[PDB]
Design a binder for this molecule. Structure first.
Ligand SMILES: CCOC(=O)Cc1ccncc1
Ligand SMILES: [Cl-]
Ligand SMILES: [Cl-]
Ligand SMILES: [Cl-]
Ligand SMILES: [Cl-]
Ligand SMILES: [Mn+2]
Length: 340
C-alpha cells in the first residue's frame, strides 16, 4: 500500500514518500524543529530524466576549462576540460590514470562556477526548482524561506543551486576516504540525488559497496531497500546534530595531537574540512564523547534535508550527480546570526 511516510535510523529519521504531497509540512515541521535531518524519496520520478545524464553534460559543456580533485590524496588536477571528467563517469577504461596506472577517483570542483547555474543551465534550473519538496521552505521566494527577508546581521546564502559531481570510491582502502570531508553550513540545505552511474569494465564492485554500508552503521530497514526493492544507492552520509559540533571539535583536536599535528588549542577542525570520520573515529565519538549521528544511504531521487549548523560528511558508493539548494528556515535562523 501507498503510505505518507516511514522511519529509518530505528525511528530517528523521518522518510516522506510523496515529494508533492501538500500535507508533508504537518509531519516535517515537528522533526525539523528538533534539529533532525529528513529524507524525501521519489524526486527522480518528477524530473525530466534526459536533462540529468552524464553524456548530455559532456556534449553541451565539454569544452569548458575546470579543475578536478583526486579524492584519494586531495591533489588538484589543474586546467583540464570538463569532458575529461564526464567521459570517465561510468566507463572506467576512459578515466585519467594516476602514476601507479590505476584509474583515479575524481571530483569535479566548483562547476558550474559560483552562482552561474541558472545562466548556464536555464532548463535544468526550472526542472529542479519546480519539483523540490517542502516548497514553502525550499523555493527562493517561499513563505518559510527567510533568505530574501533578512538584514546584514545574518549571513545570507549565495544564489544556487550548486552541483556536486564525483566518481564512486572503489577499494577496501577507499572505505576510510571522504568524497567530502566533515564540515558544516550556516544555512539549511536540500540535496537531491538526480543520477547514479553504476560503472562497467570493472563491473562487479558490488560486494565492497555492501561492506561499506554495513561498516558505515546503516540500519536493517535501509539494507532492505537494496535486497528487496532493487533501488540504486548513490552515497553514504553521516550527519550530526548542531548541538554536538563542539564535542566533535574536542575529539578531532585530541586525534590531531596524537597524530603529531601541531595546532593551537582553539583551531577549528570542522571549518578546516580536513577530516573524514571512519569506523574507528565514529566509534570513539560514541564511546568517549557520548555523541550519536545519523548514517543515511541516499538512493536515486532521495532529497536529504541538512539542518543549519549540523556537521556532515559524504562518501559516494557509485558515481553521483547531486544538486542542492540553500534556504533559511525560521526554526534554524539563530545559526546564521552574526552576534552573541
Ligand atoms: C551533495 C553530496 O555530495 C557531496 O559532495 C557532498 C556535499 C554534500 C553536502 N555538503 C557538501 C558536499
Ligand atoms: Cl538548531
Ligand atoms: Cl539547461
Ligand atoms: Cl511546504
Ligand atoms: Cl572535502
Ligand atoms: Mn555541506
Amino acid at each position: 500500500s501507498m503510505t505518507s511516510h516511514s522511519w529509518l535510523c530505528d525511528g530517528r529519521l523521518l522518510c516522506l514518500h510523496d515529494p508533492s504531497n501538500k500535507n508533508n509540512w504537518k509531519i516535517f515541521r515537528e522533526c525539523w524543529k528538533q534539529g533532525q535531518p529528513v529524507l524525501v524519496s521519489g524526486v527522480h520520478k518528477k524530473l525530466k530524466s534526459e536533462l540529468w545524464k552524464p553524456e548530455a553534460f559532456s556534449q553541451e559543456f565539454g569544452d569548458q576549462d575546470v579543475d578536478l580533485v583526486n579524492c584519494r590524496n586531495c591533489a588538484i588536477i589543474s586546467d583540464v576540460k570538463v569532458r575529461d571528467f564526464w567521459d570517465g563517469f561510468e566507463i572506467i577504461c576512459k578515466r585519467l590514470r594516476s602514476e601507479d596506472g590505476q584509474p583515479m577517483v575524481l571530483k569535479l570542483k566548483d562547476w558550474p562556477p559560483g552562482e552561474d547555474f541558472r545562466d548556464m543551465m536555464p532548463t535544468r534550473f526550472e526542472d529542479l526548482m519546480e519539483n523540490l519538496p517542502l516548497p514553502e521552505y525550499t523555493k527562493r521566494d517561499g513563505r518559510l524561506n527567510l533568505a530574501s527577508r533578512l538584514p546584514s546581521y545574518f549571513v545570507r546564502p549565495d544564489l544556487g543551486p550548486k552541483m556536486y559531481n564525483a566518481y564512486g570510491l572503489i577499494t577496501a582502502e577507499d572505505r576510510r576516504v571522504g568524497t567530502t570531508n566533515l564540515h558544516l553550513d550556516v544555512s539549511d540545505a536540500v540535496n537531491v540525488m538526480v543520477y547514479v552511474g553504476i560503472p562497467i569494465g570493472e563491473g562487479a564492485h558490488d560486494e565492497e559497496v555492501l561492506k561499506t554500508i554495513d561498516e558505515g552503521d546503516a540500519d536493517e530497514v535501509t539494507k532492505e531497500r537494496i535486497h528487496d526493492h532493487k533501488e540504486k544507492p548513490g552515497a553514504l552520509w553521516h550527519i550530526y546534530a548542531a548541538k554536538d559540533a563542539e564535542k566533535i571539535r574536542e575529539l578531532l583536536r585530541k586525534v590531531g595531537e596524537e597524530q603529531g599535528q601541531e595546532n593551537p588549542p582553539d583551531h577549528d577542525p570542522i571549518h578546516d574540512q580536513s577530516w573524514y570520520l571512519d569506523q574507528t573515529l565514529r566509534k570513539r565519538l560514541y564511546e568517549e564523547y557520548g555523541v550519536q549521528g545519523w548514517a543515511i544511504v541516499q538512493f536515486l531521487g532521495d532529497a536529504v534535508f541538512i539542518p543549519a549548523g549540523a556537521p556532515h560528511q559524504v562518501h559516494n558508493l557509485y558515481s553521483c550527480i547531486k544538486v542542492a539548494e540553500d534556504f533559511v528556515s525560521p526554526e534554524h535562523v539563530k545559526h546564521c546570526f552574526r552576534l552573541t
